[PDB]
Design a protein around this ligand. Sequence first.
Ligand SMILES: [K+]
Ligand SMILES: [Zn+2]
Lengths: 73, 77, 112
Amino acid sequence: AAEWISQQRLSLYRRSERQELSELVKNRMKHLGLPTTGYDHQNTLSYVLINPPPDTRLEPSDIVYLIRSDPLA
Amino acid sequence: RFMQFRAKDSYSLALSKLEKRERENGSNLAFMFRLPFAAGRVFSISMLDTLLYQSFVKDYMITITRLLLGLDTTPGS
Amino acid sequence: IAPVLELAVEYVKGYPPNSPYIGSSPTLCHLLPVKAPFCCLRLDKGCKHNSYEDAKAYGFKNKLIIVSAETAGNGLYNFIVPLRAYYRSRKELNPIVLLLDNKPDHHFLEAI
Ligand SMILES: [K+]
Ligand SMILES: [Zn+2]
């Protein structure tokens, strides 16, 4: 069994911090009873353009703040 | 010096004179000749601060200390 | 002396299941075949599996190690890990008694 535990030793030594955090979360989930799956990072940058010029070009993933008129009046 | 205090003991109080003599010469390890420390009964976390300041010159010192304590496990060590 | 040459209950061995914190180096340790229930980790009270209430009723074969700490956390885990490492002799395993002031939380007990 020396070869198997050596394999596990190198694998656990080569594992990163992201794997450590993921395994901690999954261990907590399986201890409380929730399924480990579903836990399956955000390479995104966002900012707010207040009143851009009327010539501004629209990009995907954009969200426009609106003042929508009163539906009741 | 207070870990195992034998007040009625000549040797334990001559160690005080030895420690004073060492401290006169600017020695940082003045506590070293106390019997509890020499026998391994007591340590202070101030050695960890000394280790941290040593790592400014000896970057390998923290890793060596952790390897001796088994805190970090590199295969083949 | 030979001259040096210039050239050349049974316990399982494995890593602890629940590492208590991120960065804890995984060490191959002597482990119980099945995790001990939280009741069996207590010297004070008796349980379904054991009615012993002090260390003499346990009848340890090796001399004990007593840790007098205030609270049990990751520090006590880092204390226990070297004493149960796989290269330490199993025949010379010293029972560890944590003399705590506060009742240990479930995280430390699950870790140990
Ligand atoms: K008991
Ligand atoms: Zn029990």
